[PDB]
Design a protein around this ligand. Structure first.
Ligand SMILES: CC(C)(COP(=O)(O)OP(=O)(O)OC[C@H]1O[C@@H](n2cnc3c(N)ncnc32)[C@H](O)[C@@H]1OP(=O)(O)O)[C@@H](O)C(=O)NCCC(=O)NCCS
Ligand SMILES: CC(C)(COP(=O)(O)OP(=O)(O)OC[C@H]1O[C@@H](n2cnc3c(N)ncnc32)[C@H](O)[C@@H]1OP(=O)(O)O)[C@@H](O)C(=O)NCCC(=O)NCCS
Lengths: 293, 293
């Protein structure tokens, strides 16, 4: 545990009992916590309770931001318990619009990549937290992927954006993997997935189509797989695909069912945290739909 | 084709012959066309030729922006064909800094998602185009993905940022597809990809590995695939995976070769704009590595 000083601020190792007082200014704020992993803190005493817990986290370097005018805008640091550098930050609704979070985060990052001896850092930010993704982008964190999450106090799951910055980026990197499913009737498989997985055909070659691409998203680039028509008169040999989704399991499940897809659900909860059900294509392929809940 | 009216500007359906004169102020400007798809127009006549072509495009709904000062700062509108609604905009250098592009783009978008009857719009902006990424951010467009592109007049490829706004709200969507490769020797397959594709391990259930996950990226969430141990005279049907990569094809080619992987030979340029080579796994699975060049 060390100290960090920037061109304005001075980050100091968080002290639950000492900082719980100023920090509650953010943790007890609903508009600021309307973005955290749990609901806002009730009392500075509970905030204290929380704080001490976070520091406990193995390898959790957290600092209390101390602003240029004897004030404490908030917290910024690295989540411990991670097997790959996590970034955390939040300010009181007022310290907003000063570039504190950006400067404090950039500070923690800068430190982390060098003297901290990390090969890179990550920041998981919800899709709607524009103010946060803003901080992250300024700091040099770019989108590396995405994953669905679910906070217990939350009525439903949500989409997290995984942004990261490396000491030095890899010159080469695979942007995506598009797997091919040898299907008996492409034209039909497309109609199926378009309703069972809400996919859309990225493109269809042939009439009827003998090769196509199903975009599991409504956006140009993103998760998808291709469909290659096959002969026989044999069938094939099942391919297995795991689809990590966003949204409730049963919501998705209900989608699969309705579309008339052959399902091996309802959603069954699994010890690794997600709930799932398996769609089985006429040809035998098995698309496991996994969701946070 | 209708009219757009804003809290300052008035967007009017583009008129190649009428507006080509003013708009050439941008298309003829090299500093303004630096991020464009094509090089600047030599003459207001070429710009007119260019402009009519643009309008000809399928669903190309373009408007000439008219500023509250009897001036024409630039153009803004929706590109045609795209499939996934597209966004365009550019201003003459002298018209920069007045919030014109933001207002006019936010106009075209606001319109496009309602009375236009579109379910969403997308804007592909190069990573470097900070000034445009700024407008996009302001209009409410968020990063949905990224892809590598390559303009002819460009000496090389470049990163494209796909931002977007959905009038809709598809709650369910796939965040990733992780395919399973029935491999005879998991422990070793990991070694291979490890060096040939630069994969990283993450899973390793069983001793020795009977199921694993090869993260083709250093980042928590991202492209990857699973390895499932399979005995008997199988598999009989090899899996086909298409990996869209970043970097030059040969560069990647060398890696796979060096790694000692079995490649079908040097990178061949394909009609769809990528150069690729295939790695063939001992069990028959075919990994096609595709790069923009
Ligand atoms: C993230 C959060 C703290 C806000 O960050 P923020 O401090 O208000 O954003 P910054 O103040 O860091 O951004 C600086 C802004 O001020 C200006 N600014 C002034 N000085 C600046 C400087 N030195 N550097 C950068 N920007 C500066 C910029 O123009 C910038 O954009 P804006 O003016 O339009 O707001 C707040 O949304 C929050 O509490 N979120 C909950 C926590 C969370 O969800 N985290 C994500 C998961 S870890
Ligand atoms: C089209 C584009 C990017 C224009 O950028 P711009 O001129 O900065 O966009 P605006 O006109 O909305 O600029 C807004 C600026 O004016 C300011 N402004 C001044 N008066 C304003 C007013 N009354 N209302 C709103 N904003 C105002 C804003 O605060 C903002 O400050 P900033 O320059 O630091 O961002 C332009 O730079 C361009 O032609 N680029 C080349 C083509 C291209 O980038 N294409 C992208 C692929 S689609």
């Amino acid at each position: 545990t060390a100290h960090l000083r920037t061109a304005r601020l001075e980050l100091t190792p968080l002290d639950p009992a000492a900082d719980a007082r100023h920090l509650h200014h953010a943790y007890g704020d609903e508009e600021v916590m309307r973005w955290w992993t749990r609901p806002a803190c009730a009392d500075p005493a509970e905030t204290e309770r929380y704080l001490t817990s976070c520091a406990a986290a193995p390898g959790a370097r957290l600092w209390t931001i101390r602003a240029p005018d004897g004030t404490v805008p908030g917290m910024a640091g690295l989540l411990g318990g991670t097997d790959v550098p996590g970034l955390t930050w939040l300010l009181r609704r007022d310290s907003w619009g000063h570039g504190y979070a950006t400067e404090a985060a950039a500070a923690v990052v800068g430190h982390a990549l060098e003297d901290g001896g990390l090969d890179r850092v990550e920041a998981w930010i919800e899709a709607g937290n524009r103010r946060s993704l803003a901080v992250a982008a300024r700091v040099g964190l770019t989108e590396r992927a995405r994953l669905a999450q679910h906070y217990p106090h939350r009525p439903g799951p949500h989409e997290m954006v995984v942004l990261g910055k490396a000491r030095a980026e890899e010159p080469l990197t695979t942007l995506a993997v598009i797997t091919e499913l040898p299907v008996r009737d492409v034209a039909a498989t497309l109609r199926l997935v378009e309703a069972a997985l809400g996919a859309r055909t990225a493109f269809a070659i042939g009439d009827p189509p003998e090769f196509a691409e199903a975009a599991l998203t409504p956006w140009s680039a993103g998760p998808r797989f291709r469909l290659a028509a096959v002969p026989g008169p044999g069938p094939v040999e099942p391919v297995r695909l795991h689809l990590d989704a966003a949204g409730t399991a049963d919501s998705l499940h209900r989608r699969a069912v309705d579309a008339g897809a052959r399902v091996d659900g309802p959603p069954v909860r699994r010890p690794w945290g997600r709930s799932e059900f398996v769609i089985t294509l006429p040809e035998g392929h098995e698309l496991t739909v996994s969701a946070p809940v």
